[PDB]
Amino acid sequence: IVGGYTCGANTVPYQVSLNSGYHFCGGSLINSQWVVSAAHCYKSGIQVRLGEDNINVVEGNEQFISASKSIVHPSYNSNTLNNDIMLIKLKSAASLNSRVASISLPTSCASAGTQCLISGWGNTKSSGTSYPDVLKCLKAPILSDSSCKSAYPGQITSNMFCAGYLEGGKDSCQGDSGGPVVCSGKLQGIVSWGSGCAQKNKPGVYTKVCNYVSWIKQTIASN
Ligand SMILES: [Ca+2]
């Protein structure tokens, strides 16, 4: 997260870190056994880390649980990042508490202008590289589809939306991929892509979660 703020420990209790020997992506806990992330974060041997603030220090509220299964969306296209969504099932149920809590799925899609909360452990610079140890947060509005499409001509599908600031300076970034965009208490986006980070006229592009609720519900009911 570029141009954000320090969230405060466990104030984003649905945020998870995906670890394969190192933090490499974020995710969102949607019930005690399931995490939503980005398909482009797929790899084998994922450990899910819940209840994290400082990802480099054990502070006492963490739960580390191995994934038993990963399910990439059946229409995910890695070239265009259309349908950039994946479900991860935990080997055992998380203990839900004040520091580890699920986020609701949307019943309806979010509106342009709604201020959302984006979070993660990704790069904090727009030029250069600095990875934080504690969780960072950004409030960012959903942009109109016309402005989104204008920013990325020929690349925006109906399963994507743009959030952020056309003037630049505030954005999600590498290492925040797969993490949450929460609007009005619902998971409405997944950190997906963008041209660099916090660049002028290049806002963040997010997976539009409300298009996937049927697939999520069906998948979870059968796995
Ligand atoms: Ca920790």
Curated annotation (Swiss-Prot):
Q: Which GO terms describe its biological process?
A: digestion; proteolysis
Q: Which Pfam families match?
A: Trypsin
Can you provide one Gene Ontology molecular function annotated for this UniProt record? serine-type endopeptidase activity
- Family matches, as PROSITE patterns: TRYPSIN_DOM, TRYPSIN_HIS, TRYPSIN_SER
Show the active-site residues.
H40 (charge relay system), D84 (charge relay system), S177 (charge relay system)
Q: What is this protein called?
A: Serine protease 1
Q: How is its activity regulated?
A: Is inhibited by scorpion cyclotide trypsin inhibitor TopI1.
Instruction: Fetch the CDD domains from UniProt.
Output: Tryp_SPc (cd00190)
Listed as disulfide-bonded, the cysteine pairs are C7-C137, C25-C41, C109-C210, C116-C183, C148-C162, C173-C197
NADP listed as a keyword: no
Q: Where does substrate bind?
A: D171, S172, Q174, G175, S177
Q: What is its EC number?
A: 3.4.21.4
GO annotation, cellular component aspect: extracellular space; serine protease inhibitor complex
Ordered alphabetically, the record's keywords are: Calcium, Digestion, Disulfide bond, Hydrolase, Metal-binding, Protease, Secreted, Serine protease, Signal, Zymogen
What residues bind Ca(2+), as annotated? Answer: E52, N54, V57, E62
Using the UniProt record, name the top-level EC class of this enzyme in a single word.
hydrolase
